[PDB]
Amino acid sequence: SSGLVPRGSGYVRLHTNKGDLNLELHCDLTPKTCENFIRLCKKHYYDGTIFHRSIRNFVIQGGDPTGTGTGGESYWGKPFKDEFRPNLSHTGRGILSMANSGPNSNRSQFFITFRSCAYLDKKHTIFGRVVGGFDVLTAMENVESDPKTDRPKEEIRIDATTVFVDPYEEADAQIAQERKTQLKVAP
């Protein structure tokens, strides 16, 4: 079927109330997952959303516009496939991966790791990593959470998201051009 092939890695800044986090996305390796996250960011899907789950030395998770822990939708509506890759593992701090409810059930929620966690490999799609704002990630980790719910006690919030490198531009441009041409001369 029709698809949108990325060209290179993507880059997204999360403007949080604790400062700015820069993410590098492995779009060539995880094209569906990168496309989902980029298109959701571009349409302001994450504006005002919180990190609803924070576990020290483990992960911090957000991307749920309902704030409940179980909400959100992919860009396309339906839950979409995992994209596990042998050269992407949860090794080191700041790995960016998708939350899910079982195999091939990705929607909008994502997490960032605080340390290596091999157990997560081949369970959650890794699609990027933090490359800037490590001090901000630390500040986030340091916010106390309710031990019963893992919800941060003071709100950690994404105010805005800037996609500063969108690797789908060339794909989108070809499709838009071809559609425009077809409408103009072969309706």
Residue numbers in the entry: 271 to 457
Structure paper excerpt:
Cyclophilins are peptidyl-prolyl isomerases (PPIases: EC 5.2.1.8) and are characterized by their ability to catalyze the interconversion of cis and trans isomers of proline. In order to understand the molecular basis of these results, we sought structural coverage of the entire human cyclophilin enzymatic class. All cyclophilins share a common fold architecture consisting of eight antiparallel β sheets and two α-helices that pack against the sheets. The active site of the cyclophilin family includes the invariant catalytic arginine (Arg55) and a highly conserved mixture of hydrophobic, aromatic, and polar residues including Phe60, Met61, Gln63, Ala101, Phe113, Trp121, Leu122, and His126.
Perhaps more importantly they are, along with PPIL4, the only isoforms that substitute the residue Trp121 with a non-histidine residue. There are no mutational or computational data for the human cyclophilins that have a tyrosine or glutamic acid substitution at the Trp121 position; we therefore made a set of mutants to both PPIA (mutating Trp121 to either tyrosine or glutamic acid) and to PPIL2 (mutating Tyr389 to either tryptophan or histidine). More importantly, the single mutation of Tyr389 to tryptophan converted PPIL2 to an active isomerase, thereby illustrating the fundamental importance of this residue in conferring activity to the cyclophilin family. Conversely, a tyrosine modeled in the conformation to coordinate with CsA created a steric clash with the carbonyl of MLE9 (1.75 Å); in addition, there was a close steric conflict with the modeled Tyr residue and Cζ of the highly conserved Phe60 residue that helps form the proline-binding pocket. Perhaps this is why in our apo PPIL2 structure the tyrosine at this position pointed away from the active surface.
